[PDB]
Amino acid sequence: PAARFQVQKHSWDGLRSIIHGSRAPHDFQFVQKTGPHSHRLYYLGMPENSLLYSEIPKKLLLSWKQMLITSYDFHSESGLFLFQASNSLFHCRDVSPMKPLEIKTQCSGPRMDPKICPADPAFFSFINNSDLWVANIETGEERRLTFCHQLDDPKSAGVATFVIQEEFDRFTGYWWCPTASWGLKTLRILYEEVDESEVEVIHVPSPALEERKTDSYRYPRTGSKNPKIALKLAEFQTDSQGKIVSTQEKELVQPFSSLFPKVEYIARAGWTRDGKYAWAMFLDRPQQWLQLVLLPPALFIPSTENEEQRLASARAVPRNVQPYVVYEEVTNVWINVHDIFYPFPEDELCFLRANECKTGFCHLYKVTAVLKSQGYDWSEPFSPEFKCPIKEEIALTSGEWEVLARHGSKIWVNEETKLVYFQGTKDTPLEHHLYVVSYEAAGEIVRLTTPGFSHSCSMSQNFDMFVSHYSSVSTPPCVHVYKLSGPDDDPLHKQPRFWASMMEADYVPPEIFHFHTRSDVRLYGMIYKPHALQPGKKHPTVLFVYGGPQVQLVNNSFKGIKYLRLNTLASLGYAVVVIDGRGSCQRGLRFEGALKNQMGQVEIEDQVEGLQFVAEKYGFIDLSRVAIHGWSYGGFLSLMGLIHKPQVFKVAIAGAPVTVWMAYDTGYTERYMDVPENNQHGYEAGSVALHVEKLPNEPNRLLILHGFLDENVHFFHTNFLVSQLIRAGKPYQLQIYPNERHSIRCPESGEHYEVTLLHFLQEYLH
Amino acid sequence: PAARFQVQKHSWDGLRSIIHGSRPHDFQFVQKTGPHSHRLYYLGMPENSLLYSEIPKKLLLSWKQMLITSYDFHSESGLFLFQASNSLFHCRDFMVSPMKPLEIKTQCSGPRMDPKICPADPAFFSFINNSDLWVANIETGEERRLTFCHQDDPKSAGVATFVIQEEFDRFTGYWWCPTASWEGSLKTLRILYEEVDESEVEVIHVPSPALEERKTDSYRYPRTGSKNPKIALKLAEFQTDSQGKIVSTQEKELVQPFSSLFPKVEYIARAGWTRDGKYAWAMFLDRPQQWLQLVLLPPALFIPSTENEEQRLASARAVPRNVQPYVVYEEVTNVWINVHDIFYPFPDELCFLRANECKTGFCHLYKVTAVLKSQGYDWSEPFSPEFKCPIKEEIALTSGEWEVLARHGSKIWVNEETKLVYFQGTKDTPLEHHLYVVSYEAAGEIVRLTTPGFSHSCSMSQNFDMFVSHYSSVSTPPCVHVYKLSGPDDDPLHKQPRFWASMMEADYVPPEIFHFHTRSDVRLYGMIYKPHALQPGKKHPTVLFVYGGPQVQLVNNSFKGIKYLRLNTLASLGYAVVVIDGRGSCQRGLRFEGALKNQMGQVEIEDQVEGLQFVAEKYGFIDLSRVAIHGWSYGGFLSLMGLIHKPQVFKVAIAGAPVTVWMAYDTGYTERYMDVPENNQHGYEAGSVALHVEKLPNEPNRLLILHGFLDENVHFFHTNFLVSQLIRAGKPYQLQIYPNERHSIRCPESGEHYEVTLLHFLQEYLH
Predict the structure, then answer these.
(1) Whole-angstrom Cα distance, residue A4 to residue A620?
(2) Which SS3 state, helix, strand or coil, does residue B640 take?
(3) Sign of the alpha-carbon dihedral angle for B637, B639, B640, B644
(4) After which residues is chain B broken (C to N over 2.5 A)?
(5) Domains of chain A in sequence order
(6) How far apart are CA B656 and CA B735, in angstroms?
(7) Changing residue 504 to R: reported impact (chain A)?
(8) What backbone phi and psi angles, to 5 degrees, belong to B333?
(9) Do B204 and A210 touch (CB under 8 A)?
(10) What CA–CA distance (Å, rounded) separates B328 from B326?
């Protein structure tokens, strides 16, 4: 009877008194001294996120020396720092602090995407009004290279399109060539042509509500056309006085569309160390194919509107020269883009490659391809091809665990010692650890980071130092510094000794658990226990959710910062439960591949099963009083829960829900759900706005939160749901966040979000 | 103890079951020359369409079919020009079977707005295509453009802009000349039109109807304070062969600019021509809207147009020195000018009729005689203003504490044979629109023609031998009776209206009208719906419905059941529904309406509170501890002021489509009443509810915000900005969107939801 625990009710000022009561170093660069200190670490920090440093001794908490910013570019030899601070451009070279030298300009608009020329630090680049610009920090001489820009000005150059930034995690459309050819010189830049003419335009309202205007995004929805892309060279010569004597636009000797048919997106691109070949990863529209291709500079002829003077150049391209397809990946699930690709320094290329499609788990391979120069008439056109034969493909790691290559995880390769350092899950899926392996000999795989914590690491250029940014479910986050030390004749077994420390430590942490499904698959989970529990009492329960691809909620690292509100929920007597269902990240391709063409359907069984296991193991779950809650995919799932499982889920608080997959973009949806023409059944099944008939008849069971300015998940989603709820005659409550986009950035808006949530549960979880 | 009526708590599906369970005009008299005396032509809906009745020589009239909201008619040729679907249609008339409408094709790409038949020649008509004036010929099929302002692209022609359409209730900006000239030494045909340069006007984005497409529409929306579009009057002439072909054409412009001849002229409220064709008249208006004045523009005042400024001087010299514009009438006020559209000119002088509220305080007719004597002007040179004619006489044909209906497409009907003027008014009572007659020669005996004890919407025959009245009362449903003026021909004033025939005929319990006096001794009217099956003793919970803003009068003697069925539904669950006409309302004169001048929100709620307190004492069934306030546009704005300045009175507040920010609203409305924000900053701030959000309730479930997402008028921005400021002040709110609704909820599905949300919200939280 009174066995079940009623949550203490509160006035609204009470609840926002409760919530108001509630309320790290990165981008490291190691450099040696050559005195008392061995190196100097450069990094970003926020003790306002500015540039800082520390001093590493020869013989303890390192102090944070001020030097003077989301990012910056560094150059080893010259010691040049180049960053986008203010709404302007700044630099400085490197005991006491120095104020940044401002780089004055003639162009109007911001200077996006600043990078320094590696081959010559006097030079550097930036975007301006969708075109590429060279400059010189010494002389101050600026100059435009691309000429695409002039509402219907579609062509752009050096820019990564909407879907490329948001769904392929790439934020530039240009890459410096790392060497020069010669008292004249020259410097090249690979860059990306983009005609966004075919792409559909969406209107979203801007920050300034007062002036009642909208911005004009190019938003390619699924089935609709993506932008038309191409690779290109942009050369420019210089004399000894640092003067841009001339420039050139360079198109491929044939079209990119006919050389490389079946290429839909440019996931990544770059250059070989020595500067010889340029490379790029190309993907197809299904995203079930990914070839990595070398493009020689001689393959690029100058651009001219004169067809005779082009055939002059198109005849002078050597017949031996061609693009080389060194690698190719193929799957029936989906090729996730893995950043890792390390070419070694001529009738063959040796490189490393992250490859999940082979065995099912991302692992490092050493691969040698063979560049059979094949003879081609490039003044004449044609179409298929360039798939080189593979000389060998030695597999350096294997098992049922991952090498981390996404989310800007990276490898580090010492060529002297023949060792490659990586990060992976080998020990557990709950902890990101730092491994080393030889690349000659796929031998034993030594770990450097101690278990019990999930680590986020960065190695020194000289492979002598490394930093780790680790944390556990219970303990707060530390940033320690380690120094690899031992006999040089045995480098694979260098012992990481604790050298120094940079960061250190009403919250009760959750405890992690696992269980098995009725189909015998291990799912990890997490639970916040009701604070000051009385064993015997069944408390009411909030099931927090995401359950979409590209994510892992449950893992062994500190949650108290981002998910403080789950602790707040638990401090008032709620049970907060979190389950990673089939579909979630970090446990291989098959596990995640559960989602394929079937979104919504597979994810709730695992969540229902999660709760019931929680309720048997732990003796405090009143299953009559359960609330499902989440944002984006989770808001989508909160509504699916309330449709598919109303017996289980009493209320639902759906934040930013994807309510119509057909209105969502290509990049995300096609990867997982195919094209609406091919997978109609699945698109309709997982569109919650087409199943509003099954939502509750009674009110107080469904709350909709949506940020008005949402660039990514458009307010249209909530607005089309309310549209359908009104037609179906179903009740709904609604909260709007007028100044918020996808995340709630403003503390005030967030306090209001959390207070509403508490009240809603308080009043109506009964 | 247990003497407070409890409303029965229904489930949501129960409440839908209850709400679901709840749910002739534009007349043209033409005589015949048999059994039937006339044929009455009109719009009607047994969709809305063209119909006719047969009025006999000697009972319920049949509705015959001709075959559409607005149509045009020409008497002699019997031409019916109308707009149907996304195209133009016509027909002519005596049929016995119905005739199909003949279709008129076009070479122009886009729809053809605003169709009007040339009065002088029925073969010709005109329309707008892409913000430019066109001209056509029904018989020959030949079209022909006349303006070239269109080709972002901000110059328009023959268009009334946003603020003019929705605040000055004018829906065309071109006017046909009623006569044809044969000048030279080819038959000419003029049109007066309004050129508009809406370049300097702010663009606002409003969501489009097709939600899937996720695109907006630009709207040239001039905020209060900011600039309106820049206007001008212009002459577009053309000529025709005796075979009926548009041979020549010509744009014309004033010999000096419009802006220089007429400084301080912010808006062209109205315009047209005198019946003979001599002068083109126009009502101008200033930015304060306190200086309206009538002007005549003689056709020789307009020279041709060329890009060459030397071709211009030549014909600027050519225009007769005597000719000019004559400022005939000048209304001035310390409150504001309401545009009264009544202006009847007759054939050295000009004699006209004109409605004038600014003179005595009540809209009354006058006979005015002005004197057009030319001063002699050198039109090659420029100048600054002057043109005010001296008045011969200004006889007043009506006077009292009651008014002549002039706004809202009301009108006068002037028989020039009998010297009588037929008008509508409030002479008997402010609660009843009645048809009156008076002589314009001898202003004495005002004879009422409509039955007392009801309120009437009327329309005279052009022959003044019979009229229609569409009438109703608070209790009885609406009727439409056809009356016939009948009696001795020697005394036309006392011709007796005899009932001739009827067109349309008449659990809802009607409301009771009452009045009471305020502590300052002003008479206010109000309604009440009693709770059905009342048990005296029980104190019921009360929904104070409201609007309160200008240009409206809710409380009057006429059938409310149609638009306020929800109010009766509320009553049938046991809610008292009270409605009070606060100070600042329509149809009580200028001084009554002028209690809002520069302090909007501050006076209305005090009158509403007194109306509640009176009704509680008068009737014994109002529980004052449980009172809800609710309304739309101004009403939702007020519902929030009630909750701000009277939380101790109002338990809850359901605010629909509210004006949360005066600075965001348009000029035409806001400035007229609140002035410009540079002058009256104290009152903009005081009556903008979004700046007083800190004073809303700390408790939840006391404030429900309703808003349609596609609101062209009261933009969603207002609710968005309110929600912004509630969030920032840490105040709860409930909220409801109507994604497919602009300003009035039009969809029945959306309206059924609106009402079930209203019943549920009150059911649960009105305690």
Answers:
(1) 9
(2) helix
(3) positive
(4) 23, 33, 46, 58, 67, 93, 151, 185, 347, 385, 506
(5) 12-22+506-764 (3.40.50.1820), 23-503 (2.140.10.30)
(6) 10
(7) Reduced interaction with NLRP1 without affecting the peptidase activity
(8) -155, 150
(9) no
(10) 6
Tell me the nearest-neighbour CA distance from A102 into chain B, angstroms: 37
DSSP A237-251: EE-TT--EEEE--EE
Query: Cβ contacts (< 8 Å) between A714 and chain B: which residues?
Result: 214
B/e letters for A535-564, b = 16+ CB within 10 Å, e = fewer, are: eebbbbbbbbbbbbbbebbbbbbbbbeebe
* Cβ of residue A663 closer than 8 Å to a chain B Cβ: yes
Interface contact B31, partner A, CB < 8 A: no
Q: Determine the Cα–Cα distance for residues B140 and B144; give it in Å rounded to an integer.
A: 12
Interface test with A, best of B727, B738, B741 (most A CBs within 10 A): B727
Instruction: Residue B727: list chain A partners with CB under 8 A.
Output: 737-738, 748-749, 752
One-letter amino acid identity for A111?
R
Tokens 């005549």 belong to residue? B296
The C-alpha of A632 sits at a distance from chain B's nearest C-alpha, in angstroms, of 19
Q: How far apart are CA B412 and CA B435, in angstroms?
A: 10
* Edge-first strand listing for the sheet containing B391-396: B343-345, B350-356, B364-370, B391-396
- CA–CA gap between residue B510 and residue B623 (Å, rounded): 21
Residue B469 makes CB contacts below 8 A (sequence gap 6+) with B435, B450, B456, B457, B458, B480, B481, B483
Please say whether the beta carbons of B620 and B538 come within 8 A. no
- The residues, ordered by sequence, that sit 6+ positions from A111 with a Cβ below 8 Å of its Cβ are A84, A88, A89, A105, A126, A127, A128, A133
Sheet with B25-31: strands ordered across: B25-31, B36-44, B49-56, B64-65
- Tokens 């030279």 sit at which residue? B184
On whether A197 is known to bind a ligand per the annotation, the reply is no
For A685-719, letters b (16+ CB in 10 Å) and e give bbbbbbbbeebbeebbbbbbbbbbbbebbbbbbbb
Cβ-based neighbours of B521, under 8 Å, separated by 6 or more: none
Experimental method: X-ray
Identify which of B365, B475, B375 has the alpha carbon closest to the alpha carbon of residue B420.
B365
Question: At A686, is the secondary structure helix, strand, or coil?
Answer: coil
Q: Quote the CA–CA distance of A592 and A589 in Å, as a whole number.
A: 5
Question: Which residue in the block uniquely carries the two structure tokens 């269980």?
Answer: A515
Q: Would you tell me how many other CB atoms lie within 10 Å of the CB of residue A520?
A: 6
Asked whether the beta carbons of B642 and B649 are under 8 A apart, the reply is yes
The two structure tokens encoding residue B283: 């009502």
| Amino acid identity, position A493 | H
- Report whether B505 contacts B535 (CB < 8 A): no
Q: Catalytic residues of A, which ones?
A: 632, 710, 742
Q: Resolution in angstroms, to 1 decimal, for this deposition?
A: 3.0
What distances in angstroms separate CA B176 from CA A566, B70, B184, B284, one per listed residue? Answer: 72, 18, 21, 19
B441, HSE (Cβ side, Cα atoms, 13 Å): 8
Mutual angle of helices B12-22 and B748-765, in 10-degree steps? 130
CA distance B253 to B234: 5
